[PDB]
Amino acid sequence: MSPNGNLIRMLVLFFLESELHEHAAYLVDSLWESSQELLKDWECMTELLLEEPVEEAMSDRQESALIELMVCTIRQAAEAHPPVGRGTRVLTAKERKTQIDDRNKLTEHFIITLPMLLSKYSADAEKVANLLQIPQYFDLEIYSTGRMEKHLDALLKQIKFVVEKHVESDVLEACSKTYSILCSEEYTIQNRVDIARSQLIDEFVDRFNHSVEDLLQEEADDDDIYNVLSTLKRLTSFHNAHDLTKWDLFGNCYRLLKTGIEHGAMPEQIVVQALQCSHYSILWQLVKITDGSPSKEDLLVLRKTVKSFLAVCQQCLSNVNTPVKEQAFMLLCDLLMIFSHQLMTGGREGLQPLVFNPDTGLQSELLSFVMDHVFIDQEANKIEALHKRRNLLAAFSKLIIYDIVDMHAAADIFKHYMKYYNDYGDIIKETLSKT
Ligand SMILES: CCNc1ccc(C)nn1
Secondary structure, three states: OOHHHHHHHHHHHHHHHOOOOOOHHHHHHHHOOOOHHHHOOHHHHHHHHHOOOOOOOOOHHHHHHHHHHHHHHHHHHHHOOOOOOOOOOOOOHHHHHHHHHHHHHHHHHHHHHHHHHHHHOOOOHHHHHHHOOOHHHOOOOHHHHOOOHHHHHHHHHHHHHHHHHOOOHHHHHHHHHHHHHHHOOOHHHHHHHHHHHHHHHHHHHHHHHHHHHHHHHOOOOHHHHHHHHHHHHHHHHHHOOOOOOOOOHHHHHHHHHHHHHHOOOOOHHHHHHHHHHHHHHHHHHHHHHHHOOOOHHHHHHHHHHHHHHHHHHHHHHHOOOHHHHHHHHHHHHHHHHHOOHHHHOOOOHHHHHHOOOOOHHHHHHHHHHHHHHHOOOOOHHHHHHHHHHHHHHHHHHHHHHOOOOOHHHHHHHHHHHOHHHHHHHHHHHHHHOOO
């Protein structure tokens, strides 16, 4: 009760104070043979997190660590295997028996307790996003079984708060994922979640729409700009895993982008999101068209939409802010690959009118960006920034393989930049091989 609360308080301390375990997931996994009993005392943990002290309280760091540790114990119990990175699969009867029993325990528990955790920590983005990893492990059918409808409502109340309080992409994307989870994994609860969601959305589309109108008609306020971005972010995060086509978001994003080119002064993060949102509208419009049995005009209305958006992305290469360019670029290398001739794979030759081949002028800018923004001259930010430029290239590389840009102009740029490996490589190799 408090004997395990002593052991768990000091386990959080051994994690933080010693750099002997860098990743919580690996620490948990290592103790899991010898200390399963302790690590699945979820009541003990939620207690520590929710109670008020007698003496000695928990510090904001140790609170965070406990939550991260907790989530890893929840995962290891649900999945019944070591975390990704320590893997190697077949269970014994008693192991399989334990898996079910644990899954039941944490579900019943966290259904009750996760809304309370979210409530208490509703403004701590790292913490909130870490807690919202939990419902993916739920035995979701228990929302009927325990007559537990009361706490499904409660989680949904708290998710609605979180999305209303926050703009960080980790938190929002955590909320969206959690909705998808709660939706199409049980009919019993589906209709209930569907409503809280499409209300959540409605309240944000109306807010965004008024903000979009506010911004464009106005000289524009720091608020008019806050309002557009803040709402758009929420909707874009969600638009990835949720089909928001019924609200014509593409139209207003398209205006926002058009204003940013025309008059040249749209704030960078509005432009980036406006793009990403538009792209997700386009993917989802496509998906309904593949799976449906679409007409001549259906295709042609999507075509006009796609060509207007490829145009915007191209023009957005010329935006001063390099984040915009990379987004613009990313979407070009996605879309030119998506609406390539591979769109007539799998007996889908109805889709010919949706195919696009990029023009010379465009291809020359898709080459330009690589010389300008993959291949560049000069802590933690740079190992990260590199993997992105890697991705930008790998995304461009796909276009080159299937001859969607000029493969020869590309490899000429690869020549120009690999020069010193081809002029002095052997020499640098054998030198380094004797030291
Ligand atoms: C037209 C409404 N927008 C405004 C005005 C003034 C301030 C400070 N903020 N926002």
